[PDB]
Design a protein around this nucleic acid. Structure first.
Ligand SMILES: [Cl-]
Ligand SMILES: [Mg+2]
Ligand SMILES: [Mg+2]
Ligand code: NA
Ligand code: NA
Length: 326
DNA sequence: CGGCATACG
DNA sequence: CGTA
DNA sequence: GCCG
């Protein structure tokens, strides 16, 4: 009764196994810090199965038959059910390696590979990085300068004010172009780490060259604290009572022919999209990305006019964004 | 055992 | 390498 | 770490 891919089941934003899923996600994150992408995926998938269940897991018995629960993930759940804590999880939480890798990878411009190199060099704190700006890219410098603001969640109230600002710039750059909220807010989140917007125009081809024009206009408005095309990863100045704060904003342009694929991809969740692309390729023999869906045997691209079209193409029941919180 | 999503800046 |  |  539980399918193996996350794209085959609804996953709501809030659920009945929060503590169990959080513990598995700590182990997934720690696996990623060590470069073990396979173990990261299994622990992510096992966590997501629990998010999709209709009620709390109370007994080890209830894991039998669930996909992605083997000896390791089952033992984690067993220990949490019996003692309220899993020793392995707590050992990770308090480890210097985990805490520092988490701190460093949270910086905009710093990935696992950079964080790991800094860790091996003996660096442990943000002030350690600030004292050796010799080692920082301009992007990392911005990420470090703005780290405190960027660690504060964005509220849905913030998002709406920001969308109107983006729309004004987009309207001058290209009348008729539209702005769609994507990412976690489109999945129903009340908070988030960043805001994602997808821009298109109803006349195919008119969107060519649009993003530079949008970015120049936002920058002339004084709203861009950092930016470096069709994707822009920015830091924006967001008004606040008597002041402002830095917020991460991503802007993406797509032609209207690709818009359903870009909307699907940029709405997430990350695990949902990985699972959907895995399902497409492995179960249906079709190659999915944020631009289209390719049949490699006929060498043809599927036209889609909606996300509903894409789910139908793949033989999947439609899931609205609020049920894609894998 | 092989596989684990797939792009762009 | 970083980003999504 | 788990699946097929
Ligand atoms: Cl691994
Ligand atoms: Mg987001
Ligand atoms: Mg984003
Ligand atoms: Na980072
Ligand atoms: Na800067």
């Amino acid at each position: 009764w539980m399918p193996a891919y996350a794209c085959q089941r609804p996953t709501p934003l809030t659920h009945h196994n929060t503590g169990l899923s959080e513990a598995l996600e700590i182990l997934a994150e720690a696996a990623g810090f060590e470069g073990s992408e396979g173990r990261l995926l299994t622990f992510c998938r096992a966590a997501s199965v629990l998010k999709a269940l209709p009620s709390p897991v109370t007994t080890l018995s209830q894991l039998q038959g669930l996909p992605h629960f083997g000896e390791h993930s089952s033992r984690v759940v067993q220990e949490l059910l019996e003692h309220g804590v899993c020793e392995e999880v707590e050992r990770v939480r308090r480890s210097e390696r985990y805490q520092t890798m988490k701190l460093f990878t949270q910086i905009f411009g710093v990935g696992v590979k950079t964080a790991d190199r800094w860790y091996r060099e003996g660096l442990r704190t943000l002030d350690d990085l600030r004292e050796q700006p010799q080692k920082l890219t301009q992007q990392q410098k911005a990420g470090l300068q703005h780290h405190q603001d960027l660690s504060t969640p964005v509220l849905r109230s913030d998002v709406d004010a920001l969308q109107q600002v983006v729309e004004e710039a987009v309207g001058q750059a290209l009348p008729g172009a539209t702005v769609t909220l994507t990412g976690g807010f489109r999945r129903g989140k009340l908070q988030g780490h960043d805001v994602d917007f997808l821009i298109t125009h109803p006349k195919e081809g008119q969107e060519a060259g649009l993003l530079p024009r949008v970015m120049c206009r936002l920058q002339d408005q004084g709203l861009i604290l950092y930016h470096q095309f069709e994707r822009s990863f920015c830091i924006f100045r967001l008004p606040q009572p008597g002041s402002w704060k830095a917020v991460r904003v991503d802007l993406v342009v797509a032609p209207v022919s690709q818009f359903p694929f870009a909307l699907l991809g940029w709405t997430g969740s990350k695990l949902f999209q990985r699972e959907l692309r895995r399902f497409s390729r492995k179960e249906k023999g079709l190659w999915l990305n944020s631009h289209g869906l390719f049949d490699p045997e006929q060498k043809t691209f599927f036209q889609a006019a909606s996300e509903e079209d894409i789910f139908r193409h793949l033989g999947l029941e439609y899931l609205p964004p609020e049920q894609r919180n894998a």
